[PDB]
Amino acid sequence: DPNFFKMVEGFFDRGASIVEDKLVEDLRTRESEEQKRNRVRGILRIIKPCNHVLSLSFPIRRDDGSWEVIEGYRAQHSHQRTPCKGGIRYSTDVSVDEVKALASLMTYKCAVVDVPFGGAKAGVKINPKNYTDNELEKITRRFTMELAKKGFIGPGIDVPAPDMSTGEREMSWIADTYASTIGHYDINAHACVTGKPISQGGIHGRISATGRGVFHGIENFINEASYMSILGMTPGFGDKTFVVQGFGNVGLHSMRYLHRFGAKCIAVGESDGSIWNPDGIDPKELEDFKLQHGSILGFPKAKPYEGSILEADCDILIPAASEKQLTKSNAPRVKAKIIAEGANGPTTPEADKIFLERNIMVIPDLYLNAGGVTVSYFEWLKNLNHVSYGRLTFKYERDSNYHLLMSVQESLERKFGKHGGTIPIVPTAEFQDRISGASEKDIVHSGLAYTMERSARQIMRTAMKYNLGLDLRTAAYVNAIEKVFKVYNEAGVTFT
Amino acid sequence: DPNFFKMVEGFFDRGASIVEDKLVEDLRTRESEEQKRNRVRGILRIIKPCNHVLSLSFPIRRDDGSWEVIEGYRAQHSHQRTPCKGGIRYSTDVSVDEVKALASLMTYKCAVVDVPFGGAKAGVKINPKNYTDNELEKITRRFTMELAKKGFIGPGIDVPAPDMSTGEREMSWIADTYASTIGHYDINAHACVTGKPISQGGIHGRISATGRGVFHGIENFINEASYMSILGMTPGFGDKTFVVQGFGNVGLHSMRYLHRFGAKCIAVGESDGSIWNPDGIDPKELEDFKLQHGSILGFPKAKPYEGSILEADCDILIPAASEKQLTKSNAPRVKAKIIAEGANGPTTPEADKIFLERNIMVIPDLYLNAGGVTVSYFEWLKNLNHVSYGRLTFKYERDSNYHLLMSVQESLERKFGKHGGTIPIVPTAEFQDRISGASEKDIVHSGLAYTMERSARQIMRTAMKYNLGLDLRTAAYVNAIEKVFKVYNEAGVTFT
Amino acid sequence: DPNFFKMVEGFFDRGASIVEDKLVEDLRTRESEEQKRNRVRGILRIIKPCNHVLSLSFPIRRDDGSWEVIEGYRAQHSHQRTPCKGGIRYSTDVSVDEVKALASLMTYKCAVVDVPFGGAKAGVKINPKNYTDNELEKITRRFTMELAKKGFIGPGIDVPAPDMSTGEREMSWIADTYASTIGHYDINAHACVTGKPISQGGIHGRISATGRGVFHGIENFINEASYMSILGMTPGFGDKTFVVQGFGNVGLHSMRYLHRFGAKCIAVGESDGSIWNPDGIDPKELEDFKLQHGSILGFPKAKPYEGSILEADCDILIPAASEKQLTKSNAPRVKAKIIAEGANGPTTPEADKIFLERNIMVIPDLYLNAGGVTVSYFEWLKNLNHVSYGRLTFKYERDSNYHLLMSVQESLERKFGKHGGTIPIVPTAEFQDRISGASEKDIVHSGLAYTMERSARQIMRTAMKYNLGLDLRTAAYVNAIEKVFKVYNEAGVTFT
Ligand SMILES: Nc1ncnc2c1ncn2[C@@H]1O[C@H](COP(=O)(O)OP(=O)(O)O)[C@@H](O)[C@H]1O
Ligand SMILES: Nc1ncnc2c1ncn2[C@@H]1O[C@H](COP(=O)(O)OP(=O)(O)O)[C@@H](O)[C@H]1O
Numbered sequence A, B, C: 001d002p003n004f005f006k007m008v009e010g011f012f013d014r015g016a017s018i019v020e021d022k023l024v025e026d027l028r029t030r031e032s033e034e035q036k037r038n039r040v041r042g043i044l045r046i047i048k049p050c051n052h053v054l055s056l057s058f059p060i061r062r063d064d065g066s067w068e069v070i071e072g073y074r075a076q077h078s079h080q081r082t083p084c085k086g087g088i089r090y091s092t093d094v095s096v097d098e099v100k101a102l103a104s105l106m107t108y109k110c111a112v113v114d115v116p117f118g119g120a121k122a123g124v125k126i127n128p129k130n131y132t133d134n135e136l137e138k139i140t141r142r143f144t145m146e147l148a149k150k151g152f153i154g155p156g157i158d159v160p161a162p163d164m165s166t167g168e169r170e171m172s173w174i175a176d177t178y179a180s181t182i183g184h185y186d187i188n189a190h191a192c193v194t195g196k197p198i199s200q201g202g203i204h205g206r207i208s209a210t211g212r213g214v215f216h217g218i219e220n221f222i223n224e225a226s227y228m229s230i231l232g233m234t235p236g237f238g239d240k241t242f243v244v245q246g247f248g249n250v251g252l253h254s255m256r257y258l259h260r261f262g263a264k265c266i267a268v269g270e271s272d273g274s275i276w277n278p279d280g281i282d283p284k285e286l287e288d289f290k291l292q293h294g295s296i297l298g299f300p301k302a303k304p305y306e307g308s309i310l311e312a313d314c315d316i317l318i319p320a321a322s323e324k325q326l327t328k329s330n331a332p333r334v335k336a337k338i339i340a341e342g343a344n345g346p347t348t349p350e351a352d353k354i355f356l357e358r359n360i361m362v363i364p365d366l367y368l369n370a371g372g373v374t375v376s377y378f379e380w381l382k383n384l385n386h387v388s389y390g391r392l393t394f395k396y397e398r399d400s401n402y403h404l405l406m407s408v409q410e411s412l413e414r415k416f417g418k419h420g421g422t423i424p425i426v427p428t429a430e431f432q433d434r435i436s437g438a439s440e441k442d443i444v445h446s447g448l449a450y451t452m453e454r455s456a457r458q459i460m461r462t463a464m465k466y467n468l469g470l471d472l473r474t475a476a477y478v479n480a481i482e483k484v485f486k487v488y489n490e491a492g493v494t495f496t
């Protein structure tokens, strides 16, 4: 199994090529100049590599009193879009080649979901389990400082974020260190980082954001007849049955929402075992179980499978966990017709081939798990707007709505001598519940959905237009390289 | 035959251990807290490693019209002293690790000649021969820009400089780019980088700098009985005889000054051959002959020697060129008693150990080729002062001098009738030729000398203290670790 | 005894009036407009009170893990002159009114010595002796932050300093915290505060400063026939004798320097007891004595003398010490002809009247103890300059000197047929010692003594203009009001 970097690289060179051709001819051959426009495919040669990587070595005083000098790095892939966005990862297993990779992935991912950020990612060679809360904070702060002092943390230059090794606490600090130091005078200092506590300016609905993203990623394709007939789906007996590998945030939620709308979870499988039950498995039962005690292992109304649900017979297989989990090997032996990448790179470029041979719809990481990002965009904005979404409008709207009903009602009662005979002025229970409890989350969620939909379509289209099949991935990376390109091209280089 | 980095790192660790002890006891034992002060040695763990290193990719459109991304990096070793100082190198061999290493050397080298800058170094993976004057420029400039936007160029942050691969022409572009871009509003924009054209704000006497440095460097030890006895030197008959390896800038000047003061140059080898002549060689002659034609090859009044001049018989051997020229191999076969490192790292750690074992004094890169830097500091200051050293005082002092003389003359004529009898009022020829041709260069040269001398003693003292002998190099690394440490200590780290 | 506030306020109001008149008629009645110029004495109404005063309550987390708020202030008296200057006091008994008063003094004191800074002062209601080194640091840093966020610390705004209750360790932190936060980009961030360690950018000669000041103050006057006659001094038998309350910093150096030049110390006190001996006491010997063990008490070659030495028959009494030590009480009983205020407000107002009636020449704190301040202003520049005074000239000068001698020589020789018969070329032993050991302190000391002089002369003149006598104080306060007024006057207010 190749390393994340070789993979992305590949992916990019793949979609690069594909593009090239088209990218010149029916996209800009009305003003052709010595067809030395083919030569402008240098742009893509620029777009490939990370423009800036900062590596650091900064001390901290451990509680005990002894000094230690921590290493870390943050890589900014592309600044085609001014604020670079990307998380920070605290783990002994970080490498400047990894962060370069993952930064690479972000730049493209964003483009996919039309989030105006450049890819970037950081990593600190540290194991959080070996440091005290106190120590951690010391580290993150001093990381924020150097990061800022050289241009790799600013609300206009590079807005970091958490990764499954870091949390809101850290972000919060990052935000606060910045705001009370370098960014003392920036009226948007709290925009420097996203994924922060609501108290510290976070945005409601961050949690469920990646999860819901998955959901809408699958949904949008499931509901297309054209793809759901090259598979033989969108049923009328079994409806839909899925499987999730990885009961960590994303998974959970993905199970929660996928189940809240028909589908029936039939397997779940963490980094400690599995579960199985071709009758179904409730989200709010398994959740609670996972919470009350240790793992999901030994859960009633379910029988313990051995290994990794990846093969379990179902319609929708969702890999919401570790890297490379679907390889050349097991690739053929997967009974699912739909693979939803609820995690970065959970399928190899060997596995792709395969799933492609045997009509398998692989819904990209590069798209499916970009729900978090999409909301992180919003968080940013929120910060810039200095107001919770809706704070001014929810009441106005609510009124506008009762008027618009009340008008119906009046006008209809004018076609019958009465003054209260008809009653349109009543919203549908669900509507009343919506308006009653209108909150930021809602707007977000919506904004989320709308992005995911409009992006799916984009993907589709840019798949049909290059006649790729179920090669949703390369369709995507292509779609992205086009975008990123367009920007670079409509300007220049040092003659931008 | 190690590598520049293992070397320096070794040199540090060496001097770091030699100091630890006496860095606690006798330097701060009359305040002692739990003797957990020996745990403060973590200041040295902090020093060791470059704190920041930026690595970038950046395009340029060659003159044919094709695009090409270029790769480079700048590493700032320390920030103990605010404006990091260090050169830029343009060569296809540059490696992060090399830069990191050189940077490392600059911090220490600066401490050695009390120059307030922190070690830095840059390198662009390019081969200037393959680019046109117009492309090179393009390249520098964009380099500057990115280097600026991320805090690696700035009159108060990092101040680059040339290297054997780069020249005042580039430095002048760096400057202007900077001035006219990010530094448009800085009243000291031109201080962003030294080693630039007089026209652009250079400092008279930049050229001869490094060379003169090397000359004094030697001189100051060659005039100290003590050392010159260990060797059996400061002779009556032969006086002194020396050879230089590398007729580049530094090697040329060295030979020029060393000669002007007695010393006979017997051999001089370049990259393309050598020259020999136990009668002597004249600098001007062998200078004009290296200018009128190509190389120094086929020079009259001098037979051609085969190979290096490193083994020629002579008193003073001076390596003014490539890296690791003196290794464990040829070490034992050198006839010279004094090796003056007129370049960085031209002697391996193994070679040192030999040289010591056979009583050979090796005047450390760290110190000897620190002339350049020394004069760069001045340049910097020259720019801050916004005036050419002496512009205001020259004439005033000249006057003050004739008024001195004039008084002696009146006061000596009032011990003898007359009113013009005795004439002291006349300056010695020399004097008159130094007053009449006063210039910035003279102030820079003197300031240079003073710093070499003062340092020299410093070294000498720190060698005798730690009973070293002719290990002038580890004295000096010690002397530097001990300066860099003080600063750090006299503040702290996060609580600095 | 009144409070420092109501005293200064008084001293101002006294000079203020004494100026008003003359500060119209012979200093501007050429242009005269309506004679409503008398109404422009509102400038002094402005000059009297402190423009701004920041109070603040910050927290720190005491080693033991608790949480406590600290209170502190910083009052900027005037800004007539850009960078406010003034120290930081750490003590439970600091009151806004006190700093305010003290700030007020600085702004005139500076004027006196021609030091371009406005008067400021800060206090922190804290007793060091109750905090650990660590805790102190936390406190002095937070302070620096909050002080910088609101414009009360800044190299061009307000440059703090140390005060009896603080040291260079703290000033070093204050500097560092600024330079690493808010002032990250200021290429003069270490000019934010003075008094700091050499290793942190301090100036050489800061600890002999206030002492050498005192000296020069007294020396300047003692060598002025005029005064020295109204007294009856500048003797031929008993040359000069002196006493010095207080043996602290300033007293000690005072004694040292005055001694070194002929005077004979004939009594030294201290907050324990006193000494005595009409044959003379050596500075070195007492100094060491003080050091070796506890306090000056029980010093050989001298007999204890109950009380204070303020009465002890001398020639020159020096009050280096505590406040209000010479009151209406003892004031007539004082054998001394000249009182040199080594500290702030030693004498009362009452006492002044008396010493005036009985022809005493009190040299005002406002001037006498301004030597510290003066240097200080150099330390500031030092930072702002980025080079140790003399670093480029020492050698150049050395040389020029020798050339000077050498010409005198040669010239003289050419009035006698021999090439080495006359030997001027040899400095005086002193001269050679000054040339050999040149250093920054020399330039600093010089500069101090030229400020002292020039300002003594100014005070005199200003006292013979307003026919004041041996009222040196007011004469000073006046000299200062004048200065500070002229700045204001030659601009305006809102239309300044
Ligand atoms: N990461 C990206 N890289 C390049 N282009 C992008 C990226 N994200 C968004 N874009 C482009 O920005 C353009 C202008 O924004 P617009 O379409 O008006 O708003 P929205 O991006 O929210 O749909 C869009 O045409 C979109 O294709
Ligand atoms: N690179 C350095 N690291 C640590 N200390 C240094 C360094 N360079 C100079 N110093 C120290 O800075 C101190 C303060 O400067 P000073 O001695 O007044 O001027 P100069 O350094 O030109 O002699 C000196 O005592 C010197 O030892």
Ligand SMILES: Nc1ncnc2c1ncn2[C@@H]1O[C@H](COP(=O)(O)OP(=O)(O)O)[C@@H](O)[C@H]1O
Pocket: C080, C081, C107, C110, C111, C113, C114, C115, C116, C117, C118, C483, C484, C485, C487
């Ligand atoms: N604090 C002050 N307030 C008002 N005037 C001042 C102050 N300090 C200095 N001055 C004035 O500034 C003027 C201009 O400076 P100058 O005399 O050339 O240099 P220097 O002040 O070092 O003697 C002087 O005439 C001096 O009287």
